[PDB]
Design a protein around this ligand. Structure first.
Ligand SMILES: O=C(Nc1nnn[nH]1)[C@H](Nc1ccccc1)c1ccccc1
Ligand SMILES: [Zn+2]
Ligand SMILES: [Zn+2]
Length: 229
């Protein structure tokens, strides 16, 4: 049930969860979809990832205002690339507190992104140190290890069957791992399986560049990454 709002698409995945989708169309390539998440947590909203641009991201906020009409308490962004952090200024202009992997905030200047206002750090088991993720509610943030990028993180939603792989995970029928220019080819496979292991009850796997899929997305992504070692 896709809901069109301006140039963006919103799809409800759970009573309190929506996928947001925005498009970037360059010459010599088809328009590229990028997906993030919107979560209503009681009387507030949480966002995972910006759209490609400030204008699109402001439209995400406008849709939230129209359909949910509750404050957006925070956003977490899942690595320092345009499809995940291209709209940071729109979030800050709206007064929304922003969070990213410390490494993402480190990379953001060079990558041409505005850094998030707060840095997450991670324990050795990969789970976010909770003292760096205040008031994340049902958002369970996990660093699976380097893969699509060295800084990519992932997000599960407590109370749902949903885990978000961002650009790390591709769908079960994908024909490649996408752009590998910033990838960690040696560690990608372990990182994909680490993501699955951290959210073992998740039956709906959401990702950046395909529609939601079964856990076969994890096994297939990892099996493709095995070929990079
Ligand atoms: O996001 C993407 N690819 C992806 N995501 N996850 N795995 N591959 C898109 N491809 C791409 C192209 C060149 C360099 C890096 C990525 C894209 C990103 C940014 C601007 C335009 C297009
Ligand atoms: Zn990326
Ligand atoms: Zn991507």
């Amino acid at each position: 049930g896709d809901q069109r709002f301006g140039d963006l698409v919103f799809r409800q995945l759970a009573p309190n969860v929506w996928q947001h989708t925005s498009y970037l169309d360059m010459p010599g390539f088809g328009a590229v979809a990028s997906n993030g998440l919107i979560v209503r947590d009681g009387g507030r909203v949480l966002v995972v990832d910006t759209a490609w641009t400030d204008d699109q991201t402001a439209q995400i906020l406008n849709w939230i205002k129209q359909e949910i009409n509750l404050p957006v308490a925070l956003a977490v962004v899942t690595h320092a690339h345009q499809d995940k952090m291209g709209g940071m200024d729109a979030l800050h202009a709206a007064g929304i507190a922003t969070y990213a992997n410390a490494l993402s905030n480190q990379l953001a200047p060079q990558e041409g992104m505005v850094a998030a206002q707060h840095s997450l750090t991670f324990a050795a088991n990969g789970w976010v140190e909770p003292a760096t993720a205040p008031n994340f509610g049902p958002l369970k943030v996990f660093y699976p290890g380097p893969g699509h990028t060295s800084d990519n993180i992932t997000v599960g939603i407590d109370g749902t069957d949903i885990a978000f792989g961002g650009c790390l995970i591709k769908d079960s029928k994908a024909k490649s791992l996408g752009n590998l220019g910033d990838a960690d080819t040696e560690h990608y496979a372990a990182s994909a399986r680490a993501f699955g292991a951290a959210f073992p009850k998740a039956s709906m796997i959401v990702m950046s560049h395909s529609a939601p899929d079964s856990r076969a997305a994890i096994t297939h992504t990892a099996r493709m990454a095995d070929k990079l070692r």
